[PDB]
Design a protein around this ligand. Structure first.
Ligand SMILES: CN(C)S(=O)(=O)c1cccc(-c2c[nH]c3cnc(NC(=O)C4CC4)cc23)c1
Length: 257
C-alpha cells in the first residue's frame, strides 16, 4: 500500500548518518525538502520488512508522526522518502544541550510521544523502535513563550527482520520479550523517558553486548529517572511482564496530570 517515487523526482544531497542497514541523506523531491533512507543491498526478507514499514506509515496520520512520501527504486537501491524534520534527532540534540533543558520541556515531549503512541495503540499498530534517535525535533521550544514539537520517525527495517545481535544492540529500548504486540512500545517508551531525563544518554550504553544480555537474563531492574515526576510511570512501563504495563491511554492521562 506504499506510494511509488521515481528516481527522476529525487536529488540526493549530504549524508546525514546511518540507520539499521541504511544510509541516510538529505534530499529534494520534485521541490520539497526530504530525507532519503537508502537500504543497504539486502535479502528479500530485509527488503520486505522495509516495504512493510513504508506501508504502515502511509496508512497513519498524526501531528507527532513524521510523513513518509513513498519508496523509490534506484537499481538495487531501495530508498524510503520521508519528511525532513528541521532540527534532527532528539538524543543528539539533548547531549549537545545537556544542562540547558528544563524539566517542563521534557514533560511536553513525554506527552507528545505518549499522544502519538496512544493513537497507534488505538489502531492496534506497533511501532517497534521507540527511542530518542527516532524522535525528531520540529521546533526547539527553549526560547520564551515556545513549546517544543517532536515528530516520531518511522521504525526503519522492522524488528522481526533483524538479527539477534542487532536486537542485543537495542537494549534497553528493546522490550525483553523480543530478545529470543503493542506492549513492546510501552517498554520502549519507558526507556526513552530514562534517556530523555538523562539528557540523551541512555542506560547500559557503555556496556558490552554480553553484559546487556546478562542484564535481561537476570531481569535486573532498570534505573530510576532523574525526576520524581516520571519515576512511577517509567517503573510501570519497564516491567518485564508485558501484560503488567499500562496502556498509553493511561500513560497519557497521567502525564497530563
Ligand atoms: C531517524 N533515524 C535514526 S535514521 O533515519 O536512521 C537517521 C539517522 C541519522 C540522522 C537522521 C536524520 C538527521 N536529521 C534528520 C531530519 N529529518 C529526518 N527525518 C526522518 O527520519 C523522518 C521520516 C521520519 C531524519 C534525520 C536520521
Amino acid at each position: 500500500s506504499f506510494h511509488r517515487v521515481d528516481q527522476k523526482e529525487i536529488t540526493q544531497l549530504s549524508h546525514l548518518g546511518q540507520g539499521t542497514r541504511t544510509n541516510v541523506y538529505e534530499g529534494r523531491l520534485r521541490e520539497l525538502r526530504v530525507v532519503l533512507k537508502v537500504l543497504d543491498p539486502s535479502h528479500h526478507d530485509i527488503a520486505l520488512a522495509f516495504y512493510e514499514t513504508a506501508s504502515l506509515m502511509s496508512q497513519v496520520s498524526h501531528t507527532h508522526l513524521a510523513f513518509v512520501h513513498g519508496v523509490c527504486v534506484r537499481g538495487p537501491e531501495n530508498i524510503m522518502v520521508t519528511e525532513y524534520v528541521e532540527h534532527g534527532p532528539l538524543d543528539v540534540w539533548l547531549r549537545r544541550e545537556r544542562g540547558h533543558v528544563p524539566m517542563a520541556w521534557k514533560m511536553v515531549v513525554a506527552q507528545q510521544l505518549a499522544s502519538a503512541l496512544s493513537y497507534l495503540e488505538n489502531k492496534n499498530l506497533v511501532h517497534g523502535n521507540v527511542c530518542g534517535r527516532n524522535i525528531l525535533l520540529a521546533r526547539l521550544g527553549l526560547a520564551e513563550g515556545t513549546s517544543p514539537f517532536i515528530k516520531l520517525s518511522d521504525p526503519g527495517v522492522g524488528l522481526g527482520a533483524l538479527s539477534r545481535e542487532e536486537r542485543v544492540e537495542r537494549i534497553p529500548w528493546l522490550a525483553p520479550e523480543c530478545l529470543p504486540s503493542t506492549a513492546m512500545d510501552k517498554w520502549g517508551f519507558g526507556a526513552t523517558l530514562l534517556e530523555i531525563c538523562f539528557d540523551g544518554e541512555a542506560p547500559l550504553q557503555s556496556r558490552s553486548p554480553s553484559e546487556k544480555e546478562h542484564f535481561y537474563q537476570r531481569q535486573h531492574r532498570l534505573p530510576e529517572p532523574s525526576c520524581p515526576q516520571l519515576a512511577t510511570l517509567t517503573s510501570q512501563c519497564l516491567t518485564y511482564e508485558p501484560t503488567q504495563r499500562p496502556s498509553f491511554r493511561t500513560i497519557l492521562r497521567d502525564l497530563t496530570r
